[PDB]
Amino acid sequence: QLAKSLAPSIHGHDYVKKAILCLLLGGVERDLENGSHIRGDINILLIGDPSVAKSQLLRYVLCTAPRAIPTTGRGSSGVGLTAAVTTDQETGERRLEAGAMVLADRGVVCIDEFDKMSDMDRTAIHEVMEQGRVTIAKAGIHARLNARCSVLAAANPVYGRYDQYKTPMENIGLQDSLLSRFDLLFIMLDQMDPEQDREISDHVLRMHRYRAPGEQDGDAMPLGSAVDILATDDPNFSQEDQQDTQIYEKHDNLLHGTKKKKEKMVSAAFMKKYIHVAKIIKPVLTQESATYIAEEYSRLRSQDSMSSDTARTSPVTARTLETLIRLATAHAKARMSKTVDLQDAEEAVELVQYAYFLSESRLKAFKVALLDVFREAHAQSIGMNRLTESINRDSEEPFSSVEIQAALSKMQDDNQVMVSEGIIFLI
Amino acid sequence: SDQVPVGNIPRSITVLVEGENTRIAQPGDHVSVTGIFLPILRTGFRQVVQGLLSETYLEAHRIVKMNKSEDDESGAGELTREELRQIAEEDFYEKLAASIAPEIYGHEDVKKALLLLLVGGVDQSPRGMKIRGNINICLMGDPGVAKSQLLSYIDRLAPRSQYTTGRGSSGVGLTAAVLRDSVSGELTLEGGALVLADQGVCCIDEFDKMAEADRTAIHEVMEQQTISIAKAGILTTLNARCSILAAANPAYGRYNPRRSLEQNIQLPAALLSRFDLLWLIQDRPDRDNDLRLAQHITYVHQHSRQPPSQFEPLDMKLMRRYIAMCREKQPMVPESLADYITAAYVEMRREAWASKDATYTSARTLLAILRLSTALARLRMVDVVEKEDVNEAIRLMEMSKDSLLGDKGQTARTQRPADVIFATVRELVSGGRSVRFSEAEQRCVSRGFTPAQFQAALDEYEELNVWQVNASRTRITFV
Helix, strand or coil: CCCCCCCCCCCCCHHHHCCCCCCCCCCCCCCCCCCCCCCCCCCCEEEECCCCCHHHHCHHHHCCCCCCCCECCCCCCCCCCCCCEEECCCCCCEEECCCCCCCCCCEEECEECCCCCCCHHHHHHHHCCCCCCEEEEECCEEEEECCCEEECEECCCCCCCCCCCCCHHHHCCCCHHHHCCCCCCEEECCCCCHHHHHHHHHHHHHHHCCCCCCCCCCCCCCCCCCCCCCCCCCCCCCCCCCCCCCCCCCCCCCCCCCCCCCCCCCCHHHHHCCHHHHCCCCCECCHHHHHHHHHHHHHHHCCCCCCCCCCCCCCCCHHHHHHHHHHHHHHCHHHCCCECCHHHCCCCHHHHHHHHCCCCHHHHHHHHHHCCCCCCCCCCCCCHHHHHHCCCCCCCCCCCCCHHHHHHHCCCCCCCCCCCCCCCCCC | CCCCCCCCCCCCCCECCCCCCCCCCCCCCEEEEEEECCECCCCCCCCCCCCCCCCECEEEEEEEEECCCCCCCCCCCCCCCCCCCCCCCCCCCCHHHHHCCCCCCCCHHHHHHHHCCCCCCCCCCCCCCCCCCCCCEEEECCCCCCHHHHHHHHHHHCCCCCCCCCCCCCCCCCCCEEECCCCCCCCEEECCCCCCCCCEEEEEECCCCCCHHHHHCHHHHCCCCCEEEECCCCEEEECCCEEEEEEECCCCCCCCCCCCCCCCCCCCCCCCCCCCEEEECCCCCCHHHHHHHHHHCHHHHCCCCCCCCCCCCCCCCCHHHHHCCCCCCCCECCCCCHHHHHHHHHHHCHHHHCCCCCCCCCCCCHHHHHHCHHHHHCCCCCCECCCHHHHHHHHHHHHHHHHCCCCCCCCCCCCCCCHHHHHHHHHHHCCCCEEECCCCHHHHHHHCCCHHHHHHHHHHHHCCCCEECCCCCCEEEEC
């Protein structure tokens, strides 16, 4: 419910809405001697065409986050989010500029155009998820800062126009120590094909009629600037605007979509009074969920070693393993449960794989296969270690070395498979 | 340094030095200044003082020299007597190896070399020159395989070790930071990781990412640990023995056989064989190791220490206070056991001579073997060395060189009950032809060969046409 209610008019992207929802909570701090979590923030990367739909997607995420800090290379200063020693002349005092993410403990910070700021921000982020604390050791200032927030990125390609005939690795324009910290990699494109123009026109007709009764096909959009001031100690919550904490509002069509008719909208006040409550829940990893992690980690790496065309922003190593544990503990915090449920483990399975990519009844069924391999498609070479190239088919059950050795006692007496040496191929 | 809370700002303080303390105190040491705090009366200068200018300062009375741990000039502190039997109640050591990185598990041989790092070797400078010392160790791995657990633990473990990484700041502020001091009219040059880590552990990640100028100064501060500064003017030599702990990274993250072993890491050959132990962290598709990785993390959500298995965690003033008492102990290698180390160096060159793709064995690795001989002799509170300190020293070297490849070097030999019998007959063929059958048995029964197996072994070769016997089987002659 909270995932589909995130983007109002923006429809689609099922795995994207269910991935950033757990990022709002931030997980839980790790209990160790150091006292800091090691990689506990999901780095969401959304790369697309330059200015076509990113102007509205980045605004629907910052508004829902109560502790959101804007970060844009064009409109906001880049040097100052970690350490900046600036001095004046009226006093002559050594001043240090701190970042806005230091005050916010465990939050979400949206960052726009990641490939535009200076290089001093590319090195300070290497200590956020690695150790967990942002230390200061510049200009003789030896101190430690607590800046543990979410690291988001929605940069644009350098040369623009993302192509669909090469590897997407050369389209983000990041260093080796930068793209290796991300998890998913969803690409949102926009094609001028007639099959997609009907879906975009569903929101264009609602935007033209959204104007005031008297500006139809005449005036423009009043939205452009933002003049916000501060007054006295007054609680501007229910006086001017009425945005109370409600579940479902009213059925609207101007800013909601077209196919969405059964689900309403959620006010911005409800998304701010629920994230801080879910942080108190501290679930414990159960036994039924720990075994599922060990059996899925061995099957994802064995099918990614031979890859080379794609799936290289995060190999199936310690990076993907830590994201599954942090996502399993954060998925249960937003469901009101003291323990981790069983369904909390299959959430990241469909997110990482889709973004990248004598013998019981076995001997009785083996006699039927002999009619099609010795009595039909003859080969005269089945048995011993050579049997492994034809025993697969569809039945599993791993065979042992003693079971495949005791089966060689027969066959010869029943005119099936003869014996020889290592790799047999007689009768 | 060790008396600050969580995030603060520096503050200067003026302390006057008079009496016998003058020309003794040097910048960098720790002192305890006590006295009063009263302003001064600036009345005399008719040029600088405009009106009153009642500045305040601090007056010193007695300065006591301290350091890092206790309040005296020492690298570390000491304990009492009842706390010594708790750590010296084992055969050698088994709870300290598991205390390193209690949150993760894996590669126990790598954690063993971390404890034998601050000990070093012999530092006496004999025959005018200065011998080598300080244990060196390099490690290659993608920064993300829980490397912070192996770095944050060793940072708080050593008393003189600051948390410094390859990134987070500029490369000219951690090994070559120049400060233009215009208040006195001098020119100094400091670092950040090798200028304040004397007789400690130098923590640094990503050894192969900085420029060539930052890797050139390591040629002299790693062998004999002598800081050489000579940039036209600054002519000084800083004394700061640092134990290098390199955390390099391969060119393809994990271990991927792409080319030669020397070209796999972007590092010149002058720094490859310079270290002592070369460990490597790889990954193999095995569900046995991954099963334990998903078990210890489960207990972290309940307990903030080690999981309830069989090992127990330690505190802080245990492994460092015990290792500091053996720093003055100088083990002596007798002339009888010294021949075993020289004979082992000859066999150590065979693995490097038949494989030029890996590291090479030269004079740089010769002095590294003698350095590890004192790392184990100081743990038993003795001043002599035994055979146990030699076999265990080369055990970590053979395990480190095998981890740099993709397999383990083993051997295969079948104990044939007739392989050494034919070699004994060869001693009589080169001496004569008509070898007597009764005379050839004078050497077979010396070692302990049963005569019953010799009768069944003659037909194994006579059937295949090797030699020939007579009717009485008393004459044997090599054809």
